Design an enzyme around this catalytic site. Structure first.
Site, mmCIF file in Angstrom:
data_model
loop_
_atom_site.group_PDB
_atom_site.id
_atom_site.type_symbol
_atom_site.label_atom_id
_atom_site.label_comp_id
_atom_site.label_asym_id
_atom_site.label_seq_id
_atom_site.Cartn_x
_atom_site.Cartn_y
_atom_site.Cartn_z
ATOM 1 N N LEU A 26 40.830 54.325 30.026
ATOM 2 C CA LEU A 26 40.291 54.525 31.396
ATOM 3 C C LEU A 26 39.146 53.556 31.693
ATOM 4 O O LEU A 26 38.189 53.488 30.895
ATOM 5 C CB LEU A 26 39.822 55.977 31.528
ATOM 6 C CG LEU A 26 39.230 56.355 32.885
ATOM 7 C CD1 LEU A 26 40.229 56.097 34.002
ATOM 8 C CD2 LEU A 26 38.781 57.809 32.895
ATOM 9 N N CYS A 27 39.226 52.904 32.856
ATOM 10 C CA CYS A 27 38.077 52.115 33.353
ATOM 11 C C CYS A 27 37.282 53.158 34.142
ATOM 12 O O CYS A 27 37.710 53.513 35.259
ATOM 13 C CB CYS A 27 38.529 50.986 34.272
ATOM 14 S SG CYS A 27 39.653 49.814 33.469
ATOM 15 N N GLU A 33 46.338 54.943 42.863
ATOM 16 C CA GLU A 33 47.766 55.031 43.279
ATOM 17 C C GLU A 33 48.449 53.687 43.001
ATOM 18 O O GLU A 33 47.906 52.653 43.438
ATOM 19 C CB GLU A 33 47.860 55.395 44.761
ATOM 20 C CG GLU A 33 49.287 55.541 45.257
ATOM 21 C CD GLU A 33 49.413 55.922 46.723
ATOM 22 O OE1 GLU A 33 48.366 56.064 47.386
ATOM 23 O OE2 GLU A 33 50.555 56.075 47.196
ATOM 24 N N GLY A 34 49.604 53.708 42.325
ATOM 25 C CA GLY A 34 50.310 52.472 42.014
ATOM 26 C C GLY A 34 51.572 52.393 42.848
ATOM 27 O O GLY A 34 51.830 53.279 43.662
ATOM 28 N N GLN A 35 52.357 51.339 42.629
ATOM 29 C CA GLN A 35 53.603 51.136 43.359
ATOM 30 C C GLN A 35 54.659 52.198 43.039
ATOM 31 O O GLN A 35 55.504 52.511 43.874
ATOM 32 C CB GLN A 35 54.158 49.736 43.090
ATOM 33 C CG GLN A 35 53.280 48.618 43.639
ATOM 34 C CD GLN A 35 53.087 48.689 45.143
ATOM 35 O OE1 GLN A 35 54.023 48.995 45.896
ATOM 36 N NE2 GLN A 35 51.864 48.409 45.593
ATOM 37 N N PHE A 36 54.598 52.750 41.830
ATOM 38 C CA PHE A 36 55.586 53.723 41.357
ATOM 39 C C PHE A 36 55.132 55.184 41.485
ATOM 40 O O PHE A 36 55.930 56.104 41.319
ATOM 41 C CB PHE A 36 55.969 53.406 39.905
ATOM 42 C CG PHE A 36 56.230 51.945 39.647
ATOM 43 C CD1 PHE A 36 57.343 51.319 40.195
ATOM 44 C CD2 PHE A 36 55.361 51.195 38.857
ATOM 45 C CE1 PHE A 36 57.590 49.958 39.962
ATOM 46 C CE2 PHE A 36 55.596 49.843 38.613
ATOM 47 C CZ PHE A 36 56.712 49.225 39.160
ATOM 48 N N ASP A 73 49.117 37.722 40.373
ATOM 49 C CA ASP A 73 48.476 38.481 41.443
ATOM 50 C C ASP A 73 47.097 38.972 41.022
ATOM 51 O O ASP A 73 46.742 40.131 41.256
ATOM 52 C CB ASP A 73 49.370 39.633 41.900
ATOM 53 C CG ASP A 73 48.947 40.201 43.246
ATOM 54 O OD1 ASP A 73 47.925 39.740 43.798
ATOM 55 O OD2 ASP A 73 49.649 41.093 43.764
ATOM 56 N N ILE A 114 43.119 59.305 40.420
ATOM 57 C CA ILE A 114 42.144 58.258 40.000
ATOM 58 C C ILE A 114 42.535 56.985 40.755
ATOM 59 O O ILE A 114 41.636 56.301 41.281
ATOM 60 C CB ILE A 114 42.176 58.054 38.472
ATOM 61 C CG1 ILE A 114 43.529 57.514 38.002
ATOM 62 C CG2 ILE A 114 41.801 59.339 37.750
ATOM 63 C CD1 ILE A 114 43.622 57.312 36.507
ATOM 64 N N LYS A 166 49.574 56.708 34.383
ATOM 65 C CA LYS A 166 50.179 56.357 35.696
ATOM 66 C C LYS A 166 51.608 56.922 35.713
ATOM 67 O O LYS A 166 52.321 56.725 34.709
ATOM 68 C CB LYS A 166 50.188 54.837 35.882
ATOM 69 C CG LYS A 166 48.817 54.196 36.066
ATOM 70 C CD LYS A 166 48.826 52.696 35.876
ATOM 71 C CE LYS A 166 49.646 51.967 36.921
ATOM 72 N NZ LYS A 166 49.537 50.497 36.778
HETATM 73 N N1 LIG Z 1 43.242 51.781 33.368
HETATM 74 C C1 LIG Z 1 42.853 52.242 34.547
HETATM 75 N N2 LIG Z 1 41.655 52.828 34.691
HETATM 76 C C2 LIG Z 1 41.257 53.292 35.865
HETATM 77 N N3 LIG Z 1 42.022 53.199 36.946
HETATM 78 C C3 LIG Z 1 43.228 52.608 36.872
HETATM 79 C C4 LIG Z 1 43.677 52.120 35.657
HETATM 80 N N4 LIG Z 1 44.881 51.601 35.851
HETATM 81 C C5 LIG Z 1 45.183 51.760 37.143
HETATM 82 N N5 LIG Z 1 44.180 52.372 37.768
HETATM 83 C C6 LIG Z 1 44.134 52.750 39.220
HETATM 84 O O1 LIG Z 1 45.441 52.601 39.880
HETATM 85 C C7 LIG Z 1 45.321 51.586 40.911
HETATM 86 C C8 LIG Z 1 46.588 50.750 40.860
HETATM 87 O O2 LIG Z 1 46.669 50.053 39.630
HETATM 88 P P1 LIG Z 1 47.605 48.790 39.470
HETATM 89 O O3 LIG Z 1 47.778 48.382 38.055
HETATM 90 O O4 LIG Z 1 47.028 47.595 40.365
HETATM 91 O O5 LIG Z 1 48.998 49.355 40.099
HETATM 92 P P2 LIG Z 1 50.139 48.574 40.894
HETATM 93 O O6 LIG Z 1 51.361 49.422 40.882
HETATM 94 O O7 LIG Z 1 50.461 47.205 40.131
HETATM 95 N N6 LIG Z 1 49.509 48.277 42.395
HETATM 96 P P3 LIG Z 1 49.468 46.765 43.073
HETATM 97 O O8 LIG Z 1 47.951 46.199 42.958
HETATM 98 O O9 LIG Z 1 49.856 46.869 44.497
HETATM 99 O O10 LIG Z 1 50.416 45.705 42.343
HETATM 100 C C9 LIG Z 1 44.100 50.768 40.511
HETATM 101 O O11 LIG Z 1 43.526 50.165 41.668
HETATM 102 C C10 LIG Z 1 43.164 51.836 39.963
HETATM 103 O O12 LIG Z 1 42.575 52.576 41.028
#
Ligand SMILES: Nc1ncnc2c1ncn2[C@@H]1O[C@H](COP(=O)(O)OP(=O)(O)NP(=O)(O)O)[C@@H](O)[C@H]1O
Ligand SMILES: Nc1ncnc2c1ncn2[C@@H]1O[C@H](COP(=O)(O)OP(=O)(O)NP(=O)(O)O)[C@@H](O)[C@H]1O
Ligand SMILES: [Mg+2]
Ligand SMILES: [Mg+2]
Lengths: 621, 621
Positions: B436-437, B365-368, B481, B363, B389
């Site tokens: 979920l969004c 990808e995050g940093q972890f 951010d 869905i 996640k």
């Molecule tokens: N609650 C959610 N519903 C749907 N998609 C999600 C949700 N949470 C995270 N995602 C997906 O995961 C991606 C990364 O989420 P995010 O919270 O920005 O992670 P991060 O590790 O902090 N990445 P970064 O933006 O580099 O700091 C988002 O752009 C969405 O595509």
């Protein structure tokens, strides 16, 4: 706590008629202050102009609702009648001054309100009906209106019109008889050439253009009624009441109506019943300086009272009145934003929208195609986890109609253990609403989950099926193929009967017939094997086959047996052995259902009563 | 309408402590008839035996609840206190006759009740704590009990023990300090050799074996209290009250307690406050033929009253009494099966169960690590569409702790536009609860949905963010951010701020510091670029960057620009051009946020008030 949902046509962002009033009101609340609030929420001029109306989801007769008739009194008067989730409230214009286009051109938000409104009735009644060019005109006008700031060269482009026809999908306002009638590149070029000339208009102008072209195909200024007129020789005509005429009425359905007087000459109003047992209403009309009443009688006191409101409100509008000229024989409200949206009932809409869906993947395979997992979005308790089944081949209308027959049959059920279908789709590949059984088929789980099963678990499986097929017998259908393959698991403590492809409604009269299909014999019941006689007998039989296999850990029936030898050994009255670790009265009832007397195999309702007792004894001991 | 949920330990099929009483009762309903019904639902002997108790989810002090103290009076007395979803009710044994194992061996369902109960307190307090062999014994006893009919050679087998350790997963009752400490084939052989000797026992016998081995590690017969004893020289001891002793008490924490009298000698009971502002309770004890009271004072009137109930109920039990020996200074109930389960509140449980989950796929990808889509199952409004996640690498505890810090921070929010995390996982790969969004990231939709956007849509995006970050300022965190990449779409009319990886709580004192990461400069605010000073200033700045890009159709910021040149041209006070079709006051507020005076860039709460006004003007005109 009094809360009311009022649909309207004041434009909102997302889908076009999900424009939902959350109105909190008092015990004395009049329609006057309610709607006063609703319009003050949108900074509007037109004040004595909107007609509040009733609506029953599963019917077509309505009430154009009066104002000082108390809100809670409506709630009384029509929840004494039927449950509310089928009731519904609707607010509309009903009134138009002389140059209503002009005296609403001064009031743009009401111009949009009337737009949405008139178009509503359009898309109800005549959308898929009136001709190609008519709806193309109206549709590209709809484009340029909903797009207040789009370019004029916008839809000139290949990929960017592919955008609209795919991602949007033109089921919104372009209708069926076109859209499912034309080739791809064809319809591209077609609506190109349509849209070429409407490149420029704004809200106001596009909307007045809509009216310019829409006047002939329907007289939205009025609403045509049928009735019978006369004092004591009386004659049954069509009727027309609108601002363009005031009040006139016809001599032919195609006649130019014969005017006699406007709303302006009106003195007072009265409605009353047709004086006999007919469900009909009188309508008498005293007029300025008239010794004469314009008497009408039409199919309903319902519409009689509504037409009384008709005249009363044109009097209000295009005179200085704001008062009730109908001769009959503290309170505050506040529009709620979201809060908790308490509290809507259940839905029953058949037509399905294709935007709020999650596209899923392989969950199960049916006779007509693959099965899927997705979520639907609505008001309260939204994003519901739901499922769909689709047909691989759309070249045969026959399987289409059977695939339809599924839902059209499965509508009317009501029980905590009969599965929740809601809607209907009408284009290839037609898909389905499914209350997803998260657990899935009980043959596989039982096969691979040997150490995850309990005595209580199997008993309660049988218990849920007990009450289920009990409700069938209470409402008369023969499922014909009950099986764990067709049995679903909702949760660890909850199973549900599915597969209603073979299910039939008995006129209670004896049997059902036979068509085609290699239904498994080992499961089937003898009399039906021999004579296509599926009734309570085979019901109880295959119910017992089901109870058996559930308690078997679901090993295949009649292990290593030939379907011809099956019925011979049945004629030898042979029944299958008890399981290991099988308890007594549960097996006893299985044997009761094993009676080679089909008439005397006991019913599920009695088995359920017995299963209820066996379940308690097991949990107790 | 009065409905109560009462947890208990009467075995049910699915997960072990989801054993939930749906009790409908009256205004005068005593605990006596309620529990009378609850046990008559399970055909039990033991009648004056179960202690009804209170429980506050977010606390640890409870009330062992009296009976004739009215049910609705409890509901009063502790919903005047706090909201109910944090309140909770619990029913338990509190009483044991002399050979309680025997006088409950006559009553098998109560033997199971006490089993579940004692084990409950076990798995609360000492599960992951007491030693390897102790819990292995207790765990294989748990096996042979929960398995009333499993074989003895059952877990001798390779694949069929792989079944248990994988599909079941032994987080149910085998504890952590073992299970996350041992190799695969090792733990296989280990619990093999454990289970070899318990091949045979039944419910009764397995359970009495559990008690045989469980007595020393905890004195479940009693519950140890601390207090201070004496008349007017007084001394602060530990205390013990149980059936094995009646009433005795200690001279050393390790002492054999010094008996003086049993419950049988009791005459009457009284509890009362410690006579000063301390939150403490007295406890005086008049006894048969005694001129003497056994006076105790302990940390609470709470437990003082509860201990009064202690003595009162052993009097009831192991004498012929059923009456209240506590000296103080019509009604019917019906256990509800399911119906509608009205009406539970919200959840707050941190620990997560891994059974009710849908495994999803890519869905985001995050940093972890990768992000996922799944559904959770509970009581009312179950099978909720939810998300998770996960972290790709589990070899670094540091990223683990940050990944934890996410949730441990994100717990405490409360708003209709802050996203719904619930729970916490504690093993590799640790995963997450996500509301979920469904729509997803707003950069991509805006990029590919150019013709699907409206002026109202963009304004309301900004409006939701307005109230969101307004609530941040009301509760003091700097997100650091904010971005549409981190902005999610719930539905067409609803966005939500996410990404709380960089978010920090200001002690309101000035700034935040800096760690590491290539955060995008074009988005960032000048003072923070230069001095790591992230406060309301940069908040308003990047808030404006966000409003901008939302209204841009989200084209990348500072198109074709170099991050070093950025801050130089900021020092030239350069701001980015207005969009096409940009309305006035909305842009005006953008410019207000563009003030190179960071102190005087206006706040979000004021911008939200302004956005609210600009939104109405747009919808109006
Ligand atoms: N609650 C959610 N519903 C749907 N998609 C999600 C949700 N949470 C995270 N995602 C997906 O995961 C991606 C990364 O989420 P995010 O919270 O920005 O992670 P991060 O590790 O902090 N990445 P970064 O933006 O580099 O700091 C988002 O752009 C969405 O595509
Ligand atoms: N509501 C549902 N939830 C989960 N899975 C479902 C659901 N409905 C159907 N399925 C899946 O689709 C498979 C076929 O469903 P079913 O209703 O038996 O189709 P069918 O066309 O009648 N097949 P047949 O059993 O040969 O008559 C089931 O075994 C499930 O795997
Ligand atoms: Mg079928
Ligand atoms: Mg981040």
């Amino acid at each position: 706590e009094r809360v009311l949902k009022v649909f309207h046509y004041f434009e909102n962002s997302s889908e076009p008629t999900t424009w939902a009033s959350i109105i909190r009101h008092g015990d004395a609340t009049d329609v006057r202050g309610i709607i006063q609030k609703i319009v003050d929420c949108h900074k509007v001029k037109n004040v004595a102009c909107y007609g509040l109306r009733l609506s029953h989801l599963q019917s077509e007769e309505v009430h154009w609702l009066h104002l000082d008739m108390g809100v809670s009194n409506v709630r009384e008067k029509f929840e004494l009648a039927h449950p509310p989730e089928e009731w519904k409230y609707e607010l509309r214009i009903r009134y138009l001054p002389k140059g209503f286009l002009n005296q609403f051109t001064e009031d743009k938000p009401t111009l949009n309100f009337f737009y949405q409104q008139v178009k509503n009735d359009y898309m109800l009644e005549i959308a898929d009906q009136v001709d190609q060019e008519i709806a193309l005109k109206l549709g590209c006008l709809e484009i340029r209106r909903s797009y207040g700031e789009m370019r004029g060269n916008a839809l000139e482009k290949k990929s960017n019109y592919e955008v609209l026809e795919k991602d949007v999908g033109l089921r919104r306002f372009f209708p069926k008889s076109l859209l499912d009638s034309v080739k791809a590149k064809t319809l591209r070029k077609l609506i190109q050439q349509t849209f070429r000339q409407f490149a420029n208009l704004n809200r106001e102008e596009s909307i007045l253009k809509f009216f310019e072209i829409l006047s002939p195909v329907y007289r939205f200024d009025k609403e045509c009624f049928k009735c019978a007129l006369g004092s004591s020789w009386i004659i049954s005509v069509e009727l027309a009441i609108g601002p363009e005429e005031g009040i006139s009425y016809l001599t032919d359905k195609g006649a130019n109506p014969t005017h006699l007087a406007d709303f302006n000459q009106v003195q007072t109003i009265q409605y009353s019943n047709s004086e006999d047992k007919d469900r009909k209403g009188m309508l008498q009309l005293k007029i300025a300086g008239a010794p004469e009443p314009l008497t009408v009688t039409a199919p309903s006191l319902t519409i009689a009272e509504n037409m009384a409101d008709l005249i009363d409100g044109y009097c209000r509008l295009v005179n200085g009145a704001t008062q009730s000229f109908i001769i009959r024989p503290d309170d505050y409200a506040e529009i709620i934003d979201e809060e908790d949206t308490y509290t809507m009932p259940s839905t029953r809409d058949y037509e399905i929208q294709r935007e709020r869906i999650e596209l899923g993947r392989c969950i199960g395979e049916g006779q007509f195609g693959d099965v899927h997992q997705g979520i639907y979005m609505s008001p309260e308790n939204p994003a519901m986890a739901v499922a769909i089944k689709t047909c691989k081949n759309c070249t045969s209308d026959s399987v289409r109609e059977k695939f339809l027959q599924e839902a059209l049959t499965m509508r009317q059920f009501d029980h905590p253990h009969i599965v929740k279908l809601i809607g209907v789709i009408t284009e290839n590949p037609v898909w389905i609403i499914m209350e997803l059984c998260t657990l899935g088929e009980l043959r596989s789980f039982l096969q691979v989950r040997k150490f995850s099963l309990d005595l209580a678990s199997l008993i309660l499986y049988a218990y849920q099926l007990s009450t289920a097929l009990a409700y069938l017998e209470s409402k008369r259908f023969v499922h014909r193929d009950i099986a764990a393959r067709n049995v679903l698991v909702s949760a660890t403590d909850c199973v549900k009967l599915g597969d209603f492809g073979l299910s039939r409604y008995m006129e209670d009269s004896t049997y059902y017939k036979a068509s085609k299909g290699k239904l498994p014999i080992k499961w089937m019941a003898p009399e039906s094997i021999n004579f296509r006689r599926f009734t309570s007998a085979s019901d109880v039989w295959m119910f017992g086959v089901c109870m058996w296999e559930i308690l078997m850990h679901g090993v295949k029936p009649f292990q290593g047996v030939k379907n011809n030898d099956v019925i011979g050994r049945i004629e030898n009255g042979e029944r299958l052995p008890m399981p290991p670790n099988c308890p007594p009265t549960l097996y006893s009832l299985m044997t009761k259902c094993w009676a080679y007397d089909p008439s005397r195999r006991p019913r599920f309702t009695e088995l359920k009563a017995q299963l209820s007792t066996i379940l308690e004894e097991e949990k107790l001991q």
